[PDB]
Ligand binder design. Structure first.
Ligand SMILES: Nc1ncnc2c1ncn2[C@@H]1O[C@H](COP(=O)(O)OP(=O)(O)NP(=O)(O)O)[C@@H](O)[C@H]1O
Ligand SMILES: COCC(=O)N1CCc2[nH]c3c(Cl)c(Cl)ccc3c2[C@@H]1C
Ligand SMILES: [Mg+2]
Ligand SMILES: [Mg+2]
Ligand SMILES: [Zn+2]
Length: 341
């Protein structure tokens, strides 16, 4: 089919994987070692996150996401201004502003050490908003390194009704996942440079790499579902539209995380592996496209872990920009996705 041919073109070359994985490893492992020399970052450890480690990276292995996490014992959080996702947190004294541990102070020292420690490896110009320090290896491979505080405490109350996976992955899996740590990354609330942001990237990876109702989903030829193929196609649809419309400000604020989040909700809506049969790829992809269009139309895209954090709030994305993306995605759906050609 046309969609199968798209998926074929989006496959990663084994040779590119071998080269890129080796280059990323050498840089990451080196910075890990060097940060451990600093009194503040002694305890950093690696967590691999994002689409490469979820096996949904498309086209080229040219962008990798990692967390350098630090266990902070005795963490005490205070939710910032009913935002549900942003928190105050109360060798680390250098980062205290009062009794709060300043996210911006920690991020600035983290960035400064990496910049000094960095194979042709450069640091990309600071992007506002992002919690990451971003590197570029050999002019081609981007690496986002996100500092994170690790907490082994119970997840914050704003997550109590999130992760609605009980009919898909099971109640016992939901309980096991909520016994894992959670993370705080230095992305600040709109106003607040002291605040941190909840992150569950590690749980997103666990879900995508163990994604079936059947434990043997995608382990044999009889159970090769099309979940990851549908996420890849949604990602490519948004990627291509953002490229075509790169000079149109209306597409600036959309990201692959909006389609990842919508995808997780469609998995909740369609929990059975038989709703993701390979033979139904076009229908499954359409289910994902129509769900995303409904999210745009209703201005509703809840964070999968934090339901009262709406990614499609008018506070974050103007109605006009969602309507613009609706228009372009409807055109694609109505014309058999010419942007894929
Ligand atoms: N807005 C967000 N809210 C929460 N977590 C986010 C957000 N944006 C990115 N992340 C996390 O950071 C990871 C890497 O971000 P990004 O590199 O932008 O996306 P990806 O999932 O890696 N897809 P891509 O790199 O586009 O193939 C995502 O997988 C999420 O786990
Ligand atoms: C092309 O890649 C960009 C990317 O990877 N990011 C930029 C935007 C963003 N926003 C985040 C939030 Cl809100 C949380 Cl909780 C955790 C991680 C992120 C990230 C990452 C570092
Ligand atoms: Mg990525
Ligand atoms: Mg990234
Ligand atoms: Zn599967």
């Amino acid at each position: 089919s046309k969609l199968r041919a798209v998926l074929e073109k989006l496959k990663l070359s084994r040779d590119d994987i071998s080269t890129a994985a080796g280059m990323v490893k050498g840089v990451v492992d080196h910075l890990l070692l060097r940060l451990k020399c600093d009194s503040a970052f002694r305890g950093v450890g690696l967590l691999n996150t994002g689409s490469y480690y979820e096996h949904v990276k498309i086209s080229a292995p040219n962008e990798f996401d990692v967390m350098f996490k630090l266990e902070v014992p005795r963490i005490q959080l205070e939710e910032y201004s009913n935002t549900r996702a942003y928190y105050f947190v109360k060798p680390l004294s250098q980062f205290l502003e009062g009794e709060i541990l300043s996210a911006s102070k920690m991020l600035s020292k983290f960035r400064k050490i990496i910049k000094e420690e960095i194979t042709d490896v450069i640091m990309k110009r600071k992007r506002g908003g992002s919690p990451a320090v971003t590197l570029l290896i050999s002019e081609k491979i981007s690496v986002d390194i996100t500092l994170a505080l690790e907490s082994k405490s119970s997840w914050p109350a704003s997550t109590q009704e999130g992760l609605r996976i009980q009919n898909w992955l099971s109640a016992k899996v939901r309980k096991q996942l909520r016994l894992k740590p959670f993370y705080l990354v230095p992305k600040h609330a709109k106003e607040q440079e002291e605040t941190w942001r909840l992150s569950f990237s590690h749980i997103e990876k666990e879900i995508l790499n163990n994604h079936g109702k059947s434990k043997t989903c995608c382990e044999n030829k009889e159970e090769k579902c099309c979940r990851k193929d549908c996420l890849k196609l949604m990602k490519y649809l948004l990627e291509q539209l953002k490229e075509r419309f790169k000079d149109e400000k209306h597409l600036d604020k959309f990201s692959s995380y909006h389609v990842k989040t919508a995808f997780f909700h469609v998995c909740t809506q369609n929990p059975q592996d038989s709703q993701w049969d390979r033979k139904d790829l076009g229908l499954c992809f359409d289910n994902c496209v129509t769900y995303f269009l409904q999210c745009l139309r209703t201005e509703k895209l809840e964070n999968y872990f934090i339901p009262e954090f709406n990614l499609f709030s008018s506070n974050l994305i103007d109605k006009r920009s969602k309507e613009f993306l609706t228009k372009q995605i409807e055109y694609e759906r109505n014309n058999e996705f010419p942007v894929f050609d």
